[PDB]
Write a protein that binds this ligand. Structure first.
Ligand code: FES
Ligand SMILES: [K+]
Ligand SMILES: [Mg+2]
Ligand SMILES: [Zn+2]
Lengths: 100, 40, 177, 43, 99, 75, 38, 43, 161, 162
């Protein structure tokens, strides 16, 4: 009943040695998430004479409030949202290499 | 790491020293012809 | 895992929310765990030139425990910059003035001394008295175990354990204990 | 506020230095090696 | 001059990054970097830290198997140390002798 | 001490060198005994003959084996 | 009180007690015998 | 009540679409860890 | 009720780690035999996909698979297009099973083949040494040879047990 | 044990003593040859401040300490148990054992500060305003130096000064 590691999160690890002792065999089939350990998808979320006329109504906040909103939204600081200069903009490479 | 254990077991402290991992040929031809010996 | 490139990258570089209970726990150990989680040193894909940090929410910061006499010996010092503006306070005074200051200062001291430390502090969350906002409670993922095991008081021990622990000496029958 | 007069490691007053456990272990190891050298030179 | 001298620091930085990633994986699996490296060496598994980090990033199940092997070797070593030495060597404690 | 090391030939560290267990060599070694490690040369299989002068290996245990197959023992 | 390094009892009435982390030689018959550890 | 595929994403709909794509790949045999194409000469 | 050597349960009476009871050697040997048999049956039936191998080459370890490219900073004295076999394999792995060598796997067990596809020289490397206030300044430019190998097939054979 | 009762009956105070049931040592000690209960039960170097089940057997109901002669312990174990009991009291591990308060005296509200391994009294030490240099650092004492000989399973020895 001895197990070096628990077998309930990633895979069932079984270790063995060949007869000559020169080869170590590792058998690790992955575990599957049980049905009981899952949540259902939250799919669920008038006499209107006029149509549902919805328009984008968001005024542009100033630099300060906008940067504060972005920092609070993304859990960051204001310096990242503050702009940069033409020197760095032109130094940045527009065609970076791609591995895969 | 493990140099003392290797010395106790009778092997070189550095795994890159004498042994099959270092002195065996690195490669050989697919047709089976042995490769020329390494300069080291 | 046969994932597409964008879902795979989004899954790999994702932020996880950890919860840490500070109920009678060493502030230094709490700060070490929080610093590890904030730096992302717990991830095999960690690198400095990336954002591998995870959100940490520490509760019960008011109920931290200091070993020894640190509440009276440990001193936090600061300077307002003006002449005669050098202020030193004890750990107890700082805790009374701000119940989330000691853990915050410990985490700030343990984090790397670079420009990412402020972002890590922003991602860090501290709440006293077991109160957490609904958003923060809903976006939680994992709860880290407490580092220090809380000892039990004499009244907490069960009668079974009391009977199991044997008597060691026989007091005189005439003593006035 | 804690100053060492003059240079730290030279002069009449110096910054104190303290021996560590690993330093003691290293010295003991070298002493054992030299003792074995003495034994092997004994014959 | 900086370019010439940075070639020494590049290897040190790479090794430090590999050690950090291996430590992260070991902590995820419940072990530590020394208890992993030493117990893998005791099993005649000569995998360098770069390969170990690559396995931790891309082969989580293989790395878990390696961690289980290291933990088993560590437990066998603890048992041997606790014993008087008369006990036979463990299955994974045997060393394949070369000549 | 520098000159005695140079005469002994131990200019490169961690490089084994062979010397004769004679009083003069011992006297030379006694001056640099705090910089060197000394072991006895153990010959479990005898001196290397002319034929097996290329299959010799000096193990970390101080043994000069004359056969080096780079293969595990079948046993 | 008088600060001293080696506290001594000037009379038999003097008694030693450790308070506030420091030793004190208190006395009642001769209050001048009161001493504080330095 | 048997898992056939799992998909990650930023939203529930995207994750479900990715899970369906993974299931389709598994059914069609175009898994990422599939057997590589054999380029050996006809022998 | 207290045998000799008994210690009442306190904070330091028992070690702070749980005790480990290793399996019996004979039963564990039987379990190992069963595991080896089932893994060998999987290998025979071909119930595996892409294989990855950690091998030793050019004084370092490479984790490679099929269609991979490796750049060795050394000339191998071979013509381009030649196929070679990497004989130093330390690890082989698949989705379900992993085999480790001590410290190397069997040649019959695992065979890894590569093809030489390119022989080049590295980009110029500058070695500049400058010493302050000593009129000491020297510069060198070097170009190390390089060889590109494409891994063609990592083939395993049933040889366990 | 023995209890004393004072009754002011009819302007005539009567002081009486009565004998109540007393605990006895558990039978078959593992080490009968020991000269103290600790060494008889092989608890030497194997207890700490958190062992309230052990500390409570040598303390008064109000939190005091029992005489060494009455307990039967040796001087070293007596001092160690006294230090452990002080640390337990400072850590609040003995809620039942509290100092006796005179009638009509209600303690004022005080801030609560959880603590453990408290060597000195909380109201005796002064703040470390000047820590000093590294070679002359003023360390904060943690734990009791008397427990330096306790078993240390960890490789790192106990740090008695932080
Ligand atoms: S416990 Fe043995 S001498 Fe006191
Ligand atoms: K000086
Ligand atoms: Mg100076
Ligand atoms: Zn007096």
């Amino acid at each position: 009943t001895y197990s070096p590691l628990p077998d309930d999160y990633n895979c069932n690890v079984e270790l063995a040695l060949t007869s000559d002792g020169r080869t170590i065999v590792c058998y690790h089939p992955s575990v599957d998430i049980p049905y009981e350990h899952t949540k259902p998808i939250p799919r669920p979320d008038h006499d209107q004479v006029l149509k549902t006329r919805l328009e984008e109504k968001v005024e542009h906040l100033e630099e300060g409030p906008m940067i504060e909103q972005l920092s609070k939204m993304f859990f960051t600081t204001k310096h990242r949202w503050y702009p940069h200069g033409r020197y760095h903009r032109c130094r940045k490479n527009l065609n970076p290499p791609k591995d895969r | 790491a493990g140099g003392q254990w290797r010395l106790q077991q009778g092997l070189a402290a550095n795994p890159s020293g004498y042994g099959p991992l270092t002195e065996l040929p690195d490669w050989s031809y697919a047709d089976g012809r042995p490769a020329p010996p390494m300069k080291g | 895992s046969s994932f597409s490139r964008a879902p795979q990258q989004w899954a790999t570089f994702a932020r996880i929310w950890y919860l840490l209970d500070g109920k009678m726990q060493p502030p230094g150990k709490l700060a070490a765990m929080a610093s590890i989680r904030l730096q992302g040193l717990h991830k095999p894909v960690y690198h400095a030139l990336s954002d591998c940090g995870d959100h940490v929410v520490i509760m019960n910061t008011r109920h931290i425990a200091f070993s020894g006499n640190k509440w009276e010996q440990k001193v936090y010092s600061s300077h307002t910059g003006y002449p005669g503006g050098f202020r030193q306070v004890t750990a107890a005074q700082l805790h009374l003035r701000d119940p989330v200051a000691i853990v915050k200062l410990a985490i700030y001291g343990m984090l790397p001394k670079n420009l990412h430390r402020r972002t890590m502090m922003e991602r860090l969350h501290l709440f006293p008295d077991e109160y957490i906002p609904e958003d923060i409670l809903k976006n939680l993922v994992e709860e880290l175990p407490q580092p220090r095991k809380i000892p039990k008081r004499l009244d907490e021990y069960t009668q079974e354990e009391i009977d199991a622990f044997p008597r060691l000496w026989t007091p005189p029958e005439d003593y006035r204990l | 506020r804690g100053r060492i007069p003059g240079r730290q490691w030279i002069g009449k007053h110096r910054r104190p230095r303290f021996v560590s456990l690993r330093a003691k272990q290293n010295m003991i190891r070298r002493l054992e090696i030299e003792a074995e050298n003495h034994y092997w030179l004994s014959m | 001059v900086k370019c010439t001298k940075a070639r020494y620091l590049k290897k040190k930085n790479m090794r430090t990054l590999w050690i950090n990633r291996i430590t992260a994986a070991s902590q995820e699996h419940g072990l530590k970097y020394p208890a992993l490296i030493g117990n893998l060496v005791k099993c005649q598994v000569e995998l360098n830290r770069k390969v170990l980090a690559d396995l931790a990033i891309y082969e989580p199940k293989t790395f878990k198997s390696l961690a289980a092997l290291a933990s088993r070797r560590r437990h066998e070593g603890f048992a041997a140390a606790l014993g008087d030495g008369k006990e036979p060597e463990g299955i994974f404690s045997r060393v394949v002798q070369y000549h | 001490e520098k000159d005695i090391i140079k005469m002994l030939g131990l200019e490169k560290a961690h490089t084994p060198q062979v010397h004769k267990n004679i009083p003069s060599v011992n006297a030379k070694l006694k001056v640099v005994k705090h910089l060197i490690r000394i072991k006895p040369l153990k010959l479990p299989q005898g001196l290397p003959a002319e034929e097996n002068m290329s299959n010799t290996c000096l193990k970390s245990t101080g043994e000069l084996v004359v056969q080096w197959h780079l293969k595990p023992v079948e046993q | 009180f008088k600060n001293k390094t080696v506290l001594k009892k000037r009379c038999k009435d003097c008694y030693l007690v450790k308070r506030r982390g420091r030793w004190y030689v208190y006395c009642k018959t001769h209050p001048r015998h009161k001493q504080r550890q330095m | 009540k048997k898992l056939i595929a799992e998909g990650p994403g930023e939203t529930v709909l995207v994750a479900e679409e990715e899970a369906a794509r993974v299931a389709l790949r598994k059914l069609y045999g175009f898994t990422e860890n599939r057997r590589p194409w054999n380029y050996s000469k006809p022998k | 009720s207290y045998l000799p050597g008994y210690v009442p349960k306190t904070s330091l009476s028992s070690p702070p780690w749980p005790e480990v009871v290793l399996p019996d050697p004979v039963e564990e040997t039987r379990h190992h035999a069963e595991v080896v048999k089932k893994v060998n049956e999987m290998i025979v039936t071909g119930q595996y996909g892409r294989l990855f191998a950690v091998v030793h080459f050019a004084s370092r370890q490479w984790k490679v698979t099929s269609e991979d490219l490796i750049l060795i900073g050394n000339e191998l004295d071979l013509a381009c297009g030649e196929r070679i076999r990497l004989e130093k394999v330390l690890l082989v792995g698949a989705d379900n099973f992993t085999l480790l060598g001590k410290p190397l796997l069997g040649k019959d067990l695992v065979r890894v083949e590569a093809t030489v596809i390119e022989k080049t020289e590295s980009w110029p490397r500058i070695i500049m040494r400058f010493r302050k206030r000593k009129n000491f300044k020297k510069k060198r430019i070097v170009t190390t040879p390089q060889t590109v190998l494409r891994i063609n097939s990592i083939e395993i054979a049933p040889c366990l047990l | 044990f023995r209890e004393v009762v004072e009754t002011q009956e009819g302007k005539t105070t009567i002081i009486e003593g009565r004998i109540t049931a007393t605990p006895k040592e558990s039978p078959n000690p593992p080490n009968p040859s020991g000269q103290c209960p600790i060494c008889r039960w092989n608890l030497k170097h194997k207890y700490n401040y958190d062992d309230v089940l052990l500390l409570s057997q040598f303390i008064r109901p109000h939190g005091g300490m029992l005489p060494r002669k009455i307990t039967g312990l040796c001087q070293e174990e007596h001092r160690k148990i006294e230090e452990c009991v002080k640390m337990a009291h400072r850590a609040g591990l003995l809620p039942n054992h509290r100092p006796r308060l005179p009638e009509g005296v209600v303690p004022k509200s005080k801030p609560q500060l959880n603590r453990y391994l408290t060597r000195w009294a909380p109201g005796s030490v002064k703040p470390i305003y000047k820590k000093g240099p590294r070679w002359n650092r003023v360390r904060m004492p943690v734990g009791s130096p008397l427990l330096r000989d306790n078993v240390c399973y960890s490789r790192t020895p106990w740090k008695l000064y932080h």
